[PDB]
Design a protein around this ligand. Structure first.
Ligand SMILES: *CC[C@H](O)[C@H](O)COP(=O)(O)O
Ligand SMILES: *CC[C@H](O)[C@H](O)COP(=O)(O)O
Ligand SMILES: [Co+2]
Ligand SMILES: [Co+2]
Ligand SMILES: [Mg+2]
Ligand SMILES: [Mg+2]
Ligand code: NI
Ligand code: NI
Ligand code: NI
Ligand code: NI
Ligand code: NI
Ligand code: NI
Lengths: 254, 254
């Protein structure tokens, strides 16, 4: 038995967080953890979002589970914006559109989509694509967002970001060796530093340093497979609110 | 009363078509015509598509109605590919994804999406985007397609292609004055000639001259608002199969 409050305050002081929410999940398996964290993430969002908020959302399996658990809230003037594009160049679907739809619906608004892949083949195309005024507006809304909600990814073989046709096998091998994970599809190492300036320069979406400026940058993540990823993310100070299970919390404190 | 067979053979000889299918629609209103043409289009597709076919589909209100009326067919080895991207930069939705999903489902396959807008801000970005190998593959499948299904659009104020954030007001004014319509979002005049090489050079999707090479290039269109558009399309020889109502057929013969 962990005093979840004790673990929370330890994480808060260790990583300089505004809030650490240690959620009880009875078993250490990833599915079970994720389910419990997604549930509390949805409750936290419902409690937190208020009139006039600009809310940035990520995508992926965690974010879709949170979305699926969202319940409506009577708020006015809320904007919900996609923080990174979710277009795939493979048959694999990110469900980014469905995820943001569910969040926007909860908050009585319509989704502000970012209708792009997150990674492009080269920095020249990225720079030409990002200059489209519609894209610029969406990226600027992502910067304005006072609330950002995301997870951290892994570099496992079946990592979603390795299945979307973005990367060649040399790049995947590099990331598997040199990154611990991604936030919004930007890859960092164990110290939170950007792994590859070249790959980062091919990416359209919220910049990691911009997350540090927000009223709430909320990281929802847990499981043994994400311990190192979370540690990197927190070391980089990319989130000020952490929603985590007690197994993973203990692993980080230890 | 029109002998629909007589009108058909007249259109066939007038425009050098492989097939003209004159569909009876009792009233001249656009909704009524479109419904009847969409229904027969779905039946024609069901009858026509066979094992191994590569089928290219367009999008828009006509194409979505056809899609909604499609019934399944037990065929093997069929590919269904999007002929032009359907991403919008406004809140207006083309339903391109839902349209191709319904066609692919009918033909026992999964959609080959073109995850792009059809028009880009400038020719430089278009050229850089089209070089992505995934995009190249989809465009090449569109060229390989032995069956292409499309409508022709108008240049009315509420034309779908004027509502997607592609064009500034100067460009819309130019197109309204100088084009009669579009096939797959490429604009032509009354003689079937491309209106603007500049706008055409900003467009990713099936090239009009490539439609002329296919076993079946199927144009489904009717209504007084599309008479001039259809005439331009047929004058350019972009379709070898026409599905049209008897009101519009009479207007073209007259
Ligand atoms: C946007 C990509 C996510 O950061 C991550 O790689 C995948 O999310 P899940 O781990 O929740 O699938
Ligand atoms: C892909 C655009 C279509 O050619 C056309 O502009 C619109 O289709 P509907 O006329 O069927 O809406
Ligand atoms: Co190899
Ligand atoms: Co004006
Ligand atoms: Mg549980
Ligand atoms: Mg009818
Ligand atoms: Ni409430
Ligand atoms: Ni450390
Ligand atoms: Ni444990
Ligand atoms: Ni049949
Ligand atoms: Ni003529
Ligand atoms: Ni009539």
């Amino acid at each position: 038995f962990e005093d979840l409050d004790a673990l929370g305050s330890i994480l808060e002081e260790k990583y300089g967080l505004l809030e650490a929410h240690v959620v009880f999940s009875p078993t250490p398996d990833y599915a079970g953890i994720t389910h419990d964290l997604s549930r509390y993430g949805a409750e936290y969002m419902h409690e937190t979002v208020k009139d006039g908020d600009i809310v940035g959302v990520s995508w992926g399996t965690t974010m879709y589970q949170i979305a699926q658990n969202m319940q409506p809230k009577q708020v006015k003037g809320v904007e919900v914006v996609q923080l990174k594009g979710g277009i795939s160049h493979s048959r694999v679907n990110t469900y980014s559109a469905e995820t943001i739809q569910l969040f926007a619906e909860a908050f009585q608004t319509m989704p502000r989509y970012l209708p792009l892949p997150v990674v492009f083949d080269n920095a020249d195309v990225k720079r030409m694509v990002e200059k489209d005024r519609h894209i610029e507006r969406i990226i600027e809304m992502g910067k304005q967002a006072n609330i950002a909600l995301f997870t951290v990814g892994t570099v496992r073989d079946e990592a979603l970001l390795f299945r979307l046709g973005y990367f060649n096998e040399e790049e995947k091998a590099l990331l598997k060796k040199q990154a611990v994970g991604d936030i919004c599809s930007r890859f960092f190492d164990a110290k939170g530093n950007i792994c590859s300036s070249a790959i980062n320069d091919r990416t359209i979406g919220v910049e990691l340093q911009d997350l540090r400026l927000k009223e709430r940058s909320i990281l929802v993540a847990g499981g043994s497979r994400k311990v190192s990823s979370i540690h990197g993310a927190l070391t980089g100070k990319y989130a000020n609110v952490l929603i985590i299970d007690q197994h993973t919390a203990r692993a980080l404190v230890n």
